[PDB]
Design a protein around this ligand. Sequence first.
Ligand SMILES: COc1cc(-c2cncc(-c3ccc(C4CCN(C)CC4)cc3)c2C)cc(OC)c1OC
Ligand SMILES: COc1cc(-c2cncc(-c3ccc(C4CCN(C)CC4)cc3)c2C)cc(OC)c1OC
Ligand SMILES: COc1cc(-c2cncc(-c3ccc(C4CCN(C)CC4)cc3)c2C)cc(OC)c1OC
Lengths: 290, 285
Amino acid sequence: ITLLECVGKGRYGEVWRGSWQGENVAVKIFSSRDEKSWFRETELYNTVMLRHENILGFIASDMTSRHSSTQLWLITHYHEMGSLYDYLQLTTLDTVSCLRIVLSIASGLAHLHIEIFGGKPAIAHRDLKSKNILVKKNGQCCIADLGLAVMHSQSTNQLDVGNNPRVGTKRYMAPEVLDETIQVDCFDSYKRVDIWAFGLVLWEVARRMVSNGIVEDYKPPFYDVVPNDPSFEDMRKVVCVDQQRPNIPNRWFSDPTLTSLAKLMKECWYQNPSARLTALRIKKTLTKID
Amino acid sequence: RTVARDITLLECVGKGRYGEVWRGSWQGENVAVKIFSSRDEKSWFRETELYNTVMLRHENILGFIASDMTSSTQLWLITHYHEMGSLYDYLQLTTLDTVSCLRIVLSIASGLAHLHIEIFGTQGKPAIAHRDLKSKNILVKKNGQCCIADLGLAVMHNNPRVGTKRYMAPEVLDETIQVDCFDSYKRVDIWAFGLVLWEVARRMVSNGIVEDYKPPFYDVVPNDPSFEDMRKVVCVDQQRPNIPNRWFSDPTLTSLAKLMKECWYQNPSARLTALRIKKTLTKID
Ligand SMILES: COc1cc(-c2cncc(-c3ccc(C4CCN(C)CC4)cc3)c2C)cc(OC)c1OC
Ligand SMILES: COc1cc(-c2cncc(-c3ccc(C4CCN(C)CC4)cc3)c2C)cc(OC)c1OC
Ligand SMILES: COc1cc(-c2cncc(-c3ccc(C4CCN(C)CC4)cc3)c2C)cc(OC)c1OC
C-alpha cells in the first residue's frame, strides 16, 4: 500500500486515498483515542454476509506494533466522489437522482437492520449521517463506519452492544439519546435511533432537489437553532426542551415527490420511538415514490 | 509513504484444530505466523482485543508484531519467532543442569507474574489470567529464558474453546470454580504452572540420573484424556504427579518439589502466588 492523498482528518484519526495492486483503496488510520471503534468495525466486517452494494466494501483490517507504538488500519473500497455531505455542498438533484440516493440509503439500512438466518445478525449503526454515506459512480450510496454498531440475534436472544465509550454525532442524536432515557438493553431502541438520523439525512438530501426552479442551500440538521460546533446540551435544548424538528420549506408542497418525502421524514421524527417507521417500510415507500 | 506488508511463508512448524503456525520472513527477519481456522476465530478476536487494550511488552511474553484480518475472512497473528520451539518440544531432546532448569522456571514465573499483576497508569496494564498454560504454550528463546504464548483464552480483570483438560485445576474439573472472581483464574494458572515445573524438573540431571520426558498424569490417564478421566484422578482420588526419590538427594530438586506441592493444593486460595514463586526461585542455589 502507497498512501497518496489525505481525504479526511479529525479526532478519530485520518483517512487516506491509497494505491494497492494499481487500484485506489481507502485507508483509515485510527487514533489510539478511538481504538475501540477499530476493533468494533473489525468484529462487524468479520460477517461475510454483511457484504452489500449499499455498505462500504471491506478489504482488510490490521493492528501492527513495535515497542509501545500501535498502528490501527482499516482498508476499504475508495469512492472518489466522497461522502454525501461533500456531494450535496455543490450539486443539486433532480427527482430521479434524489430518489436513487435516498432509496439506496434505505436499502443499506434495511439490510443492516434485518437478521439473516443460516448469515448476519441484525445490526443498528448508531452514527448515521451524511458524512458516513459515500456516493458511488452509479448514483447509489453506501453506508460506512460500523465502529458504534450494536448486533442482535433473535435466534439466541443475544444483544451485543460492544465496548465503546464513543457516542453518536451530536447533531443527529434522537431525543431519547439526548435526554439519556433510551432503553440500553433493547435492540429495537437502537434501530429507532437510526431511523431518526435517516430522517435528518432525507431532509438534507431533499433540500438539494430542485422543484419549480427553486432549491435550498446545503445546511446540516438544526443549522439555524444551535451554536456552531453544538454541545450535547445545545442539541438537547432544541430537540428535547424546544421540541424542534427541521423545517419543511413551503415550496416542497408544490411538488408531489417532496410532499411525499416530507411525510416520510415526519414519520421518522416522532418523539415516541415506537411510532417511527421501520427501515423496511421506508424502503418499500421509496420503491413506490415517483 | 509506501507500507510494505510482504510476509513470505517459508515452512509450517505446527498444525492442529486451532489452525497452523508458519515460520515466515518479514523485511529479512524470521516471524511466526498463526493462521486461524474459522472454528477458532474467537481465539484471534480475544488475543487481538487484549493487545488493542494493552500492548504487552515483556521478555517472558511472546512478542506481538501484528494481527491481520483479510477478506471468507482470513485471520493471522504475527509474532516473534523462537527457532528452539516450545518447551514441550525442547524437553524431549535435551536434559538440563541446575542453572538452565532454574533459568527456565524463573523466566516462566516472571512472565506469569507480569500477566497476573495490575499496574496503574497510562503506562500500566489490567491483571490478566492465561487460562491455558502448558509446556506447548511456552517457547524457548536462544538466551535460555522462556516466553509464554497464546492469549486466546486469556481474561483481563475463547468462547467454545476451554483449557487443555490434562492441565485443568480441580475446581475446573468439579465445576466449583467461582466464575465471577478474577483471583480464581489466577489460581487455575498456578495449578498449571506447578505441572509445567514438574515436567521441567524431571529433565534436570542429578547424580547422573534423569527422568524421561512425560506429560503430567501420563501414568494415570489415556492420551486425550476425557473431562471425567481427569476429574476422577484430580478431584475424586486427589492424585498429584509423582516426586521421584532421586530428587530428595538434590537441593535444587528438593526445593522445586516443595514449590510444586504449594501449587497443587485442593483449596485454590492456599496456592502460592506467581510473585511468591519468583521470590522462592531467586533464593534456590
Ligand atoms: C511491527 O513490526 C515492525 C515494524 C517496523 C517498522 C517499519 N516501518 C515503520 C515503523 C515505525 C517508524 C516510526 C514510528 C514512530 C516514530 C516516533 N513517533 C513520531 C511515532 C511514530 C513508529 C513505527 C516501524 C516500527 C520495523 C520492524 O522491525 C524491522 C518490525 O518488526 C518485525
Ligand atoms: C465515513 O467513513 C469512512 C469513509 C471512507 C472513504 C471511502 N471512500 C472515499 C472517502 C472520501 C474520499 C474523498 C473525499 C473528498 C471530499 C471533498 N474534498 C474537499 C476532500 C475529500 C471524501 C471522502 C472516504 C472518506 C473510508 C473509511 O475507512 C477506510 C471510512 O471509515 C469506515
Ligand atoms: C504456542 O503458540 C504460538 C507459538 C508460536 C511459535 C513461535 N516461535 C516458534 C514456534 C515453533 C517453531 C519451530 C518449532 C519446531 C518445528 C521445526 N523443527 C526445526 C523443530 C522446531 C516449534 C515451534 C512457534 C509455534 C507462534 C504463535 O503465534 C504466531 C503461537 O500462538 C500464539
